[PDB]
């Protein structure tokens, strides 16, 4: 037998009730970081064709690093 | 890097493709190349290009312990890489100093 791809996964997605209550407006003073994450995570997710038309290769992953807190 | 492309060809391309030029000259075939300059100047770009154009297998030796299982279960010497380098001759062993 072949199982459905979404089956057999010990890790589950985030449900609507598991969505954190933290807003963007809750975060203060991270415009450079907010922009880069938007341009590299959420904008390619919705504008993948505009990246292809322009010629930018969207980053597959994003590494966020820095001092704790 | 037109000047640099010519320089690296005379040392990595010609000995592989035309060993007779060096035998006629009576000189030893070159074996070691050092590319030096500021980071991002094309050293890794040119080293990969020559290996691509000469059909020489390109091996990057970063000393990573993540790749040691492929090099060999011993991992006591870096010369254990020569076993997999000989099997893929012609080969180019490339190491980049991060510094």
């Amino acid at each position: 037998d072949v199982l459905p791809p979404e089956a057999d996964s010990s890790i589950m997605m985030l449900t609507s009730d598991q969505k954190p209550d933290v807003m963007y407006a809750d975060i203060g003073g991270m415009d450079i970081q907010k922009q880069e994450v938007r341009e590299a995570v959420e904008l390619p997710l919705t504008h993948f064709e505009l990246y292809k038309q322009i010629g930018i290769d969207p980053p597959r992953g994003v590494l966020m690093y820095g001092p704790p807190g | 890097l037109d000047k640099q492309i010519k320089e690296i060809k005379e040392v990595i391309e010609l000995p592989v493709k035309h060993p007779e030029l060096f035998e006629a000259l009576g000189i030893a075939q070159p074996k070691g190349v050092l590319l030096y300059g500021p980071p991002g100047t094309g050293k890794t770009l040119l080293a990969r290009a020559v290996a691509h154009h000469t059909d020489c297998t390109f091996i990057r030796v970063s000393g990573s312990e993540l790749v040691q299982k492929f090099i060999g279960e011993g991992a006591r010497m870096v010369r254990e890489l020569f076993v997999m380098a000989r099997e893929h001759a012609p080969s180019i062993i490339f190491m980049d100093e991060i510094d």
Partner: protein, 51 residues
């Protein structure tokens, strides 16, 4: 650095004004470029820049 070990040492200087234009001419092909871009001026706008 001892003679006989490294048979050739090749220098990779930072690209000058003309070499920066060639590198600029190479990586800009992968983009949807409007006709008439003055890549020469942008190269002049980047002194001492790497490829």
């Amino acid at each position: 650095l001892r003679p006989g070990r490294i048979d050739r040492k090749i220098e990779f200087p930072p690209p000058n004004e003309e070499a920066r234009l060639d590198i600029l001419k190479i990586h800009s092909r992968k983009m949807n470029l409007t006709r008439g871009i003055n890549l020469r001026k942008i190269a002049e706008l980047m002194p001492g820049a790497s490829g």
